[PDB]
Amino acid sequence: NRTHDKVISQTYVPAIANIAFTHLSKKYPQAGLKVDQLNTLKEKTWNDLGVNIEHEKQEILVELSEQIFVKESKLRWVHEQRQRLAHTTYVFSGLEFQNVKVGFFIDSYNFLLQELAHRSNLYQSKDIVGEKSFHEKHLEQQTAPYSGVKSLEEPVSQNKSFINSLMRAIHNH
């Protein structure tokens, strides 16, 4: 009943739950939506709580995008928030969460946030420098300049010879 699979990061789940519960309590003061009840609220459905999440979904998404700051994303905060808002609204426009639990909505939003962060990081660790690719190494090697022959460039009478001048023009161009 419990596998050896890494669970999605829960760092922002408390913040998402707090923001959503605050916004929903602004409309349903008696709903009893509190952060301390997340462990028990996630097991109930919106119908049981008498809350129509469909109407407030867009406002919840906007508030979450404007409030939550993710430091794990590779994009600056403004771009990250705008991209998160667009992605979340597009994904949730076709999803009806009314008949499912609050935990499903919270986990879906957290998964979207984590996937956006991973895509921003290019599905690679942000704290690992990594190794350059073959193309990067080749481009750096090609961009590296050519030193040439310093002996021919050295100021000497012998270097004024026609043969030496030809060699310098051929090898130090």
Q: State which of positions 28-47 bind other proteins (CB under 8 A).
A: none
- CB nearer to other proteins: give 36 or 131: 131
Q: Phi, psi at residue 45, to the nearest 5°?
A: -95, 165
- CB nearer to other proteins: give 33 or 61: 61
For residues 69 and 81, what is the distance between their CA atoms, to the nearest angstrom? 8
DSSP β-bridge partners for residue 45: 101
List of residues 6+ apart from 122 with CB closer than 8 A: 74
CB 67 within 8 Å of CB 18: no
14 contributes a contact to other proteins by CB under 8 A: no
Q: Number of residues in contact with other proteins, rule: CB under 8 A?
A: 95
173 contributes a contact to other proteins by CB under 8 A: yes
- CB nearer to other proteins: give 33 or 116: 116
Instruction: At 38, list the tokens.
Output: 């997340």
Q: Which listed range, 14-22, 32-40, 80-88, lies at the site for other proteins (CB under 8 A)? A: 80-88
Restricted to residues 141-170, the positions that interact with other proteins (CB under 8 A) are 141-153, 155, 158, 161, 163-170
Choosing from 15, 31, 35, 91, the residue that interacts with other proteins (CB under 8 A) is 91
CB 117 within 8 Å of CB 72: yes
